[PDB]
Structure 1
């Protein structure tokens, strides 16, 4: 069994910013989800080898996780908040696409997504 390379978290060619919205995405949004009891399956890329999911990366072609998002935020990988918000939404969508309705993992994603939406609802205006 083989995992793909992880998503990119570093690229000197990619233009970067440190904005108040991106700071909020780290300090409020990422931190709130990371500390949650249901955070652990989402704190690193899906390990298809260890989890015995040989079809995971056959079905999921745009992998994303909070480990990657955390690295992207801490290393100022993004230009804007929209990029980061998309990463969170890709993470949730992947979970819903791969898994069955009512699965424990789907309920975990839903609880995290509820908090995500609550926090992004009060994304600050750009300074």
Structure 2
């Protein structure tokens, strides 16, 4: 019923770096997806209380959202591009698992995922 704590965006024990690929993921990939007309459901964690989704955090055991990814990029949480790409892929997959094919939210996630794949196809070499 109650929401879990959000995914961590700060952890002094976790190793991290600034890389050209992580800068690309913030300034090109996230920038593009964040501004999209369909971004808004993905800009913060799923509020399963407000949305009356009492099963959401029973079905989705690795929550992720672009608000969390934005904070992780801006606050240098990540070691490499793969960690950040995995977060985006977890966000999309969660949406596809919880919802039905052709649901509005699934079509919105698919539109963001198409733009995501366009942009990571052109990920710079390290």
- Aligned mates of 2:99, 2:40 — CA distance in 1: 17
Unpaired runs of at least 5, structure 1: none
Listed one character per residue, the Cα deviations across residues 6-56 of structure 1 (whole Å, up to 9, x for unaligned) are: 001000111110010000000000000000000000000000000110000
Distance in structure 1 (CA, Å) of the matches to 2:57 and 2:105: 17
How well do the aligned residues superpose, as a CA RMSD in angstroms? 0.6
Paired residues in the alignment total 126
| Unmatched 5+ stretches in structure 2 | none
TM-score if structure 1 supplies the norm length?
0.98
Distance 2:117 2:34 in 1: 15
- Segments ≥4 residues shifted beyond 3 Å: none
Per-residue deviation, residues 81-122 of structure 1 (Å, max 9, x unmatched): 000000000000000000001000000000000000000000
Q: After superposition, what is the alpha-carbon deviation per residue over 1:38-75, rounded to whole angstroms, capped at 9, x for unaligned?
A: 00000000000001100000100000000000000000
Name the CA distance, whole Å, in 1 between partners of 2:36 and 2:61. 27
Please report the TM-score for the alignment, with normalisation by the length of structure 2: 0.99
